[PDB]
Amino acid sequence: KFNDGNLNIAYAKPTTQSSVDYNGDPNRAVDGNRNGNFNSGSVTHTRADNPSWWEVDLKKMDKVGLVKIYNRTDAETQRLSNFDVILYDNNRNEVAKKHVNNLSGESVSLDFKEKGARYIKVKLLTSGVPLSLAEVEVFRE
């Protein structure tokens, strides 16, 4: 629930994703565990979807600052590439979007500067690539 003294508002929130494979249910990206080894149980996994995506629902409009996305680490790390992070309001209107080409480390940090949003979606832009996320943390600043 807190990471380095900052309240992670995504923790334990409802999640969905495009499909599930390998029992990589979407709630694994909000289970409080940054472990990126798939075999740990901490990491989501969709099927090879058109495209694969994952989303957290904050349950109401909230304010979104830092969003930190933790990649799978044990294998297939390149899958988390060429992707959008999209904020939606209560009526699923897009209110902000950032594109990430790839990760040089195990995570990427994005600052949405306190934009009002209820949903944060991670969407791969390449057809037929599974989406796996170790953790998605969201902070209000």
Ligand X SMILES: C[C@@H]1O[C@H](O)[C@@H](O)[C@H](O)[C@@H]1O
Distance between CA atoms of 25 and 68, rounded to whole angstroms?
Answer: 19
Candidates 18, 31, 118, 137: give the one binding Ca ion (CB under 5 A): 31
Distance between CA atoms of 16 and 113, rounded to whole angstroms?
Answer: 24
Residue 80 vs 87, nearer CB to ligand X: 80
55 contacts Ca ion (rule: CB under 5 A): no
Residue 28 vs 68, nearer CB to Ca ion: 28
DSSP 38: G
Q: Which of 28, 108, 101 lies closest to 66 in space, CA to CA?
A: 108
3-state secondary structure of 96: strand
Name the residues that contact ligand X, by CB under 6 A. Answer: 22, 38, 75-76, 130
Residue 78 vs 102, nearer CB to ligand X: 78
Binding site partner of 42, from ligand X, Ca ion, none, Cβ cut-off 5-8 A by kind: Ca ion
